[PDB]
Design a protein around this ligand. Structure first.
Ligand SMILES: Nc1nc(=O)c2[nH]c(=O)cnc2[nH]1
Ligand SMILES: Nc1nc(=O)c2[nH]c(=O)cnc2[nH]1
Ligand SMILES: Nc1nc(=O)c2[nH]c(=O)cnc2[nH]1
Ligand SMILES: Nc1nc(=O)c2[nH]c(=O)cnc2[nH]1
Ligand SMILES: Nc1nc(=O)c2[nH]c(=O)cnc2[nH]1
Ligand SMILES: Nc1nc(=O)c2[nH]c(=O)cnc2[nH]1
Ligand SMILES: [Zn+2]
Ligand SMILES: [Zn+2]
Ligand SMILES: [Zn+2]
Ligand SMILES: [Zn+2]
Ligand SMILES: [Zn+2]
Ligand SMILES: [Zn+2]
Lengths: 163, 163, 163, 163, 163, 163
């Protein structure tokens, strides 16, 4: 058996989003990024000549990216933000009493504590494994999945799961 | 006399900002970008061997970028947004009655009608000529200034002035 | 009125194709490329804040690229190739008596004399103006259209039309 | 002793080739790519200041690439292609009865089952170790060799050998 | 606990320097490079949402780069160079009796034997750990630090320390 | 007749050199760069399908680059440097009385006043037209030649000649 590592990466695997980091003692101003995602995986080359078809990987990365793209990333588990539902908006009040309000539909509520690159990457990795499907990955012999997310190309975070 | 065209471009000449486009009949959701700026100019090579010192160009592009970076870009002349001052926030009401509110300090109020790439580029070009200084540019023989702004590397707008 | 130049460019605006150059006294071996296309245009910024919406440009460039992608590029006007229809194949006989045969469906018959970068670019430019629609371009004030095609990133050809 | 990992990568380490994937139940149309190869290795830094001279690595990667470049990649061990010698051509008949014919000299016969990125990478890795020479690699303390091949920059396969 | 790997990389993390390689039996001519440095590290994501703040990493990489930038790199432990102090210059005499002389202030004396990419990388790694501070890295849970240095983008050396 | 513009650009069209800028009132420290050159030209597409064969352009750009590569760039017409021949070295004395000495063979004597990007570009343009040959360019209908030189990718100078 022959192991290969596949990498799919593209300026297409992007989500252009607004965010701000907040944690204990720190809040920054609202801004945004063209976030980019790459996926790496390892398995044995199968009888058909592939570890797993690149086209499936690309389809599923684009799908996950598209869910995030063109929204404000709202970290629904933050311990330093007060997230209120007001009519059809989310109102966010910070530790320093700063207030934001956005239409709910402009936001993507993500089960993270901070909109950091690291926590966004963990979320995406989990979503990708779900979307490609873990049993399907195992049929293809895949035993390692790894996502890299960048806020900007100069700063990236990479997370993995052995499966 | 020998003409040369200088180009300065860098992932450093960036402003990571939130925005949304609105015009008659169209509003999009809040999102953001790593905007990037390049500057091109033309003049004669001077006796010192330069058209104009690259380091001055870089300093002034970084300065203009830094003013925008890490904010929401607020187009203060939009004919389809109602921009209200509420306490220490800007409240923005759209044609479709969508409402946003952001701390004033999180916003940069820019004298444009739309936060399009084109209008942002025009603004930056004007600011750059002011910051480098038009009489200084003329002492160096510069007769053409051109800015390229990208929301994402795949889509760029370029504007110029003959001076 | 304010002129802007728009550029759309992406590793997505690709057509991965087989070809070979043939002209009088020269034939090369069958090979291929990841061809890439960029589009540049000029017009006035309209009241909506755009010269013309980038999304329309991207949609139409992708459409033209997709027609070419994943085929052999067959220059149907070559004066040095004998192009025969044999059953459901094209059989190509060269000046040096070299012979090729490919299923017709694997080929894209393009109204060019040589599969050079230059002639491919001319073809794409014409197709793009047709697909975006010339009257529509004129409604947006566009007066210049320019395509760059590369066989490989190190060698590109650029063609334009004033409209 | 101090371990270092060397990487050599260049748009020069390219082979511009035609191919098509075929496996049980699947055939695609003839097309091509600018394939790109990078080489990574690990060893101890030697007394001369290098793990192994980059110039040797580059020379040998270019040599292997040049053997493939500008041809159709013919997978000589495919279980779904019927590969016939007809005069000075190879005639290829597929499971769906599609037929191709190319001059033999336009083809590179490679001891692989599929012209996938993965199997091409395995072939290149083996060829590179042969060309650099395994005993020479061991004199330099090299204990790991790894090749990355891309059909297009967005999709890459990486294979390695511990030596 | 969740491990993440952070990467910071930028054309900004550059040192534009002159050098030449010399070892037993080999001297090359004086030349230079735009050297580039990237830093990778691993640790657990902390309660604040980061492994360690990217801004600290960037600040410290820029600081180390700036110390080297715009000088001749003088390997002070070379066994094949005779390094003499002459007035306010360093005079370097080679095995082949070639002689150089540079103002001392134009040189950076680095505790390496050869100005190879590998040895420069080792030096930078050590300097970076000192500048970020090893106890601080350990407070953040960082257990792995890795530097990549390139003389040119096509040839890179990577070194690491487990901490 | 159909005009096309050809561009050839590659990390291969490089010269890795040492230099320093000096002009009246300014001297900088010795350092270096991976300089890069691109060539753009315009002409009509000829009957063979090319403006001019890319391979000729590439060959001649590589040749010019190779002459400069791996040396100190010595501006032989500087009005602020005293350039002395001492044995088999060049000794350079600056306005501030700084002194350098390099073997003559490590230097390329270039007929420029400053080793600026602009003046290096002018020199390269002239050399390229000579190497490709002006009458040959005219046989191909070429009427415009343009060189871009960068010290680093963030700062480029472009010069042209109408022919
Ligand atoms: N580690 C880290 N992750 C981030 O997402 C991050 N974002 C910032 O804006 C500043 N530092 C950061 N540092
Ligand atoms: N021309 C143009 N300029 C933009 O800034 C723009 N932004 C978008 O989000 C979509 N289309 C655009 N089209
Ligand atoms: N001008 C030019 N156009 C091409 O498409 C081209 N293709 C080649 O393979 C070699 N030279 C070329 N030269
Ligand atoms: N894993 C994988 N390897 C390939 O070479 C490949 N080529 C394709 O055209 C489509 N999917 C692929 N998938
Ligand atoms: N391994 C290696 N390291 C270098 O820094 C290096 N520099 C050169 O100029 C030529 N070969 C090299 N080889
Ligand atoms: N115009 C310009 N040309 C150069 O070559 C240049 N080099 C520098 O080091 C600093 N500024 C520069 N400015
Ligand atoms: Zn951010
Ligand atoms: Zn946008
Ligand atoms: Zn070709
Ligand atoms: Zn393919
Ligand atoms: Zn070097
Ligand atoms: Zn310099």
């Amino acid at each position: 058996d022959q192991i290969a590592e596949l990498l799919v990466e593209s300026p297409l695997f992007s989500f252009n989003c607004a965010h701000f980091i907040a944690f204990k003692g720190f809040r920054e101003t609202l801004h945004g990024h063209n976030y980019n995602v790459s996926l790496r995986l390892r398995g044995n080359i199968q009888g058909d000549g592939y570890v797993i078809d690149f086209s499936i990987l690309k389809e599923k990365v684009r799908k996950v990216c598209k869910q995030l793209d063109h929204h404000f990333i709202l970290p629904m588990y933050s311990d330093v933000l007060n997230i209120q539902e007001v009519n059809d908006n989310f109102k966010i009040t910070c530790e320093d009493n700063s207030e934001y309000s956005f239409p709910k539909r402009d936001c993507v509520q993500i089960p993270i504590k901070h909109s950091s690159t690291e926590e966004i990457g963990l979320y995406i990795l989990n979503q990708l494994i779900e979307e490609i499907d873990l049993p399907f990955l195992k049929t293809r012999s895949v035993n390692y999945m790894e996502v890299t997310v960048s806020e900007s190309p100069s700063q990236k975070a990479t997370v993995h799961r052995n499966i």
